[PDB]
Amino acid sequence: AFIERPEDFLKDKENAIQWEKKEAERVEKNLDTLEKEALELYKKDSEQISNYSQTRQYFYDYQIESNPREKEYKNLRNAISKNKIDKPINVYYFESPEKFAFNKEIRTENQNEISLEKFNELKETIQDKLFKQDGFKDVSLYEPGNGDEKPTPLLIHLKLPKNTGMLPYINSNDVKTLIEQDYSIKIDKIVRIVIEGKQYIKAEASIVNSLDFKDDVSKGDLWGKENYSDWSNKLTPNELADVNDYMRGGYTAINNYLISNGPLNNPNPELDSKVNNIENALKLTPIPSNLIVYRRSGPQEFGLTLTSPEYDFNKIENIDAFKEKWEGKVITYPNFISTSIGSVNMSAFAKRKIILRINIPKDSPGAYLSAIPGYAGEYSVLLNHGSKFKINKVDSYKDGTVTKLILDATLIN
Amino acid sequence: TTALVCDNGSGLVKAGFAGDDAPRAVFPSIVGRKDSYVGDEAQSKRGILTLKYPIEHGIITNWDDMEKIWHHTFYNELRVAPEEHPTLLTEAPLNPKANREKMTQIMFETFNVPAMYVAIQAVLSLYASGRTTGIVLDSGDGVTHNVPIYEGYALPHAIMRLDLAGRDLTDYLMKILTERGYSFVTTAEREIVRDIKEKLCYVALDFENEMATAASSSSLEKSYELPDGQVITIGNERFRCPETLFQPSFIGMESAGIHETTYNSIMKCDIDIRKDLYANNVMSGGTTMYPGIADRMQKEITALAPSTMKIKIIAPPERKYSVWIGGSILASLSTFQQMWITKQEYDEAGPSIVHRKC
Numbered sequence A: 001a002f003i004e005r006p007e008d009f010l011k012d013k014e015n016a017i018q019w020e021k022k023e024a025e026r027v028e029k030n031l032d033t034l035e036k037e038a039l040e041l042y043k044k045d046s047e048q049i050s051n052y053s054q055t056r057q058y059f060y061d062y063q064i065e066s067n068p069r070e071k072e073y074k075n076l077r078n079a080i081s082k083n084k085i086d087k088p089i090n091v092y093y094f095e096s097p098e099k100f101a102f103n104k105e106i107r108t109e110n111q112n113e114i115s116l117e118k119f120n121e122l123k124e125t126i127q128d129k130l131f132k133q134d135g136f137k138d139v140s141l142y143e144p145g146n147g148d149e150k151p152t153p154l155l156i157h158l159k160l161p162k163n164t165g166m167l168p169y170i171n172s173n174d175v176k177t178l179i180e181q182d183y184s185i186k187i188d189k190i191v192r193i194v195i196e197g198k199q200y201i202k203a204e205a206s207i208v209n210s211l212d213f214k215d216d217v218s219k220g221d222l223w224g225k226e227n228y229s230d231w232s233n234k235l236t237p238n239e240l241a242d243v244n245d246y247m248r249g250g251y252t253a254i255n256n257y258l259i260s261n262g263p264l265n266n267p268n269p270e271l272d273s274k275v276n277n278i279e280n281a282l283k284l285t286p287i288p289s290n291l292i293v294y295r296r297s298g299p300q301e302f303g304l305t306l307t308s309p310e311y312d313f314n315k316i317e318n319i320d321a322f323k324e325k326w327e328g329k330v331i332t333y334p335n336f337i338s339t340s341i342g343s344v345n346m347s348a349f350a351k352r353k354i355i356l357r358i359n360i361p362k363d364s365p366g367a368y369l370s371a372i373p374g375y376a377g378e379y380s381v382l383l384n385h386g387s388k389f390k391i392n393k394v395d396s397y398k399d400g401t402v403t404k405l406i407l408d409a410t411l412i413n
Numbered sequence B: 001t002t003a004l005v006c007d008n009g010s011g012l013v014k015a016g017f018a019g020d021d022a023p024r025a026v027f028p029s030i031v032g033r034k035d036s037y038v039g040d041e042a043q044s045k046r047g048i049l050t051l052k053y054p055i056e057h058g059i060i061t062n063w064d065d066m067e068k069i070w071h072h073t074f075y076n077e078l079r080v081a082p083e084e085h086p087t088l089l090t091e092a093p094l095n096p097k098a099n100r101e102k103m104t105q106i107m108f109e110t111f112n113v114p115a116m117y118v119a120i121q122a123v124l125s126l127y128a129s130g131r132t133t134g135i136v137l138d139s140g141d142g143v144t145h146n147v148p149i150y151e152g153y154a155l156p157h158a159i160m161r162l163d164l165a166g167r168d169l170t171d172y173l174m175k176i177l178t179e180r181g182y183s184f185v186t187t188a189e190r191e192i193v194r195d196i197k198e199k200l201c202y203v204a205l206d207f208e209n210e211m212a213t214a215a216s217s218s219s220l221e222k223s224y225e226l227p228d229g230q231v232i233t234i235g236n237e238r239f240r241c242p243e244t245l246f247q248p249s250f251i252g253m254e255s256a257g258i259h260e261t262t263y264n265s266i267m268k269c270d271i272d273i274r275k276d277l278y279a280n281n282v283m284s285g286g287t288t289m290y291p292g293i294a295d296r297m298q299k300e301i302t303a304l305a306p307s308t309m310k311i312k313i314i315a316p317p318e319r320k321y322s323v324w325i326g327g328s329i330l331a332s333l334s335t336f337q338q339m340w341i342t343k344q345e346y347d348e349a350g351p352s353i354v355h356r357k358c
Ligand SMILES: NC(=O)c1ccc[n+]([C@@H]2O[C@H](COP(=O)([O-])OP(=O)(O)OC[C@H]3O[C@@H](n4cnc5c(N)ncnc54)[C@H](O)[C@@H]3O)[C@@H](O)[C@H]2O)c1
Pocket: A251, A252, A255, A259, A294, A295, A296, A297, A298, A299, A300, A301, A302, A332, A333, A334, A335, A337, A338, A339, A340, A349, A378, A379, A380, A381
């Protein structure tokens, strides 16, 4: 071994384990009793603690605040985010292909080979997509090899950047590594490899960071006010008139005009003027970072109604049919569309079942409207008319007894 | 020297004199479309004109039309000169700052009032029953709010708003009566159905039970005589209509119902005051007038709250005018007189004086 660790231990399992063991010993010096307690509980109940860490943000603020699971979540997250790596490191872990919206077996566990058909199917499915990752996850510093456990045919080989939080620790005989996923994954390349007489797909992956405030609406609002106090003074009086008209409830007429293709079917020069100014207003201060926003969609955006049998997502077949129709598809909104920096549920859309979780690239047209006094309570970001969103992945979760859907999507224009 | 109280709502304006027990004038918040047409005289025509509501979901959205409403209020309904009377206006909870500034500018620059003030409607309704602490359910023609108030202060971060109120209930009743085999579709028929709603609807204590009863019994049926003498029957529509408040999915909305917004509002308040709120749930506004609504709210909040919680719903017979009555009492108080914005203060400070004083 060298005096300095490599960025990737590769198949050097013996040096990876020894290095991470030293690292576990060193970080033990920096964890307080509450953090050590958090780690111990995690060892004893990892699956449920990880599950909670993935969906805790989607409930009412007061439901989140009252959940006793918050203590474990916050304390374990503190433990992790505190040991930041000072240069990149590559990690290894297995995923279900379903995680990247490949809702079939790549091969069965008793098959040893992977067909060219399946390889190409997978490639087309996970090509050109950012996949949002959340929650606690155990990873390995070395590539699984002969006599390592290999639960699926899909091995992720992930490059983590400098300042990534990672918690090395020991669980009885084993040296482990905990991270909290808080980024999107891009699959740069896939390759078929062989480990111990079986074919696996190895996915060469990297991350894209975005601001994701989740349930921390106060922080998101601070960020929004910080970046959009200016904006409201930068508008021509025409633009300011036209955006308050929109916000003050003009949106319904303006958006119906757009959705009905009025500009072409039945031009109305006044409305076209309003559409134009609102668009120019959204280009005035483009979204200053990569940013995750959330929208609770009405079923009509996905061709359903309240009484559609297909909107009953408590039945798995309806989830499958939804995925078959929408997952991997690109959708377009002729209307201007509102989103929030917050993921929390709210009274006004408490029962909506379809949540869009949207990655907005830096410099996209958009505005934090809750910098403009009068309507702060929504923590709103308005997106430009004609936006296109690629749906990368559909997840589901329980809100009480009601199954709801999370649509991992990316703004692509 | 007598102050005016003008409670301007989405559907109705309630206006009168401070010190009176009831508003002198109650008239529709409509303009027919300088010059102008207002109230039941905005029914000069529903023809060369159509009716326009300047207050939408409790917020003023057209200032020219609202000036006409206020003109009609002073000169036609109350028969007073605005220059001779301090005027108390009401506003919705969370009324935007620019909105209350514009209200202030219009009162002083257009109407030349000697003094004015803008008070939050829900705070006035709480005050009408002699309370300064409680949570108000204020439900009118256009909007419903839950407003928690502690020692005279509304708590803005815990205010809930639903754009579901009396007009939506009327429109839903038109639909389900039409599905029964009748036909209620026109603007005049909407008024008739509003009357049916106000006379015959009620909130069931157990909705699914009530639906089973009506299904296998004629005992929930009521009759109603139309203006031309046709007598119609109404059955489960009686309680399906206001059920919408608790189940907004009935009209296609995926918001929380009024029991859940009440609970959400309480849960947003400091834990130390929640018991005071549970013990002082007050109802205000025309859409809280349904028989059975206080009992149903009791039952729904009981199911949400801890089993040890003491819950009291207060629904005064006068609730329909609770906001106005609260304004009449407030404007009459000796300790309120220092709170009026005078024309002199407006001249010194401009419209933003309203934030300093109201
Ligand atoms: N929905 C959210 O998560 C969210 C987030 C932030 C702010 N808001 C605020 O809420 C108010 C708007 O409410 P909203 O966004 O629920 O209503 P909306 O105006 O986006 O939608 C109204 C109705 O039209 C449907 N719809 C919209 N676009 C459509 C399309 N392209 N095709 C088919 N159907 C379509 C919706 O499903 C809904 O039934 C605004 O004040 C907005 O600022 C909402």
